[PDB]
Homo-oligomer: 21 residues x 4
Amino acid sequence: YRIXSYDFXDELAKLLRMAAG
Amino acid sequence: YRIXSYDFXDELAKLLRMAAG
Amino acid sequence: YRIXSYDFXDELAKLLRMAAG
Amino acid sequence: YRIXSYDFXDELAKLLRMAAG
């Protein structure tokens, strides 16, 4: 799930993990 | 990834799919 | 994450939910 | 999606990225 070359999907996954611990 | 009994993770996955086709 | 006309990413997400539900 | 002290969900997401990168 990318906006151009930016992996939005991956970055969203990182936020889910960081928020959840 | 749930807010209480609501599966936010799952619903987010559905949005990623619906938006992307 | 597709394998041809198959949304593998989506199926994996549904599997995670099914197994954890 | 954890298996004990292991974030399986996170590792799966990273694998999808690695294989598709």
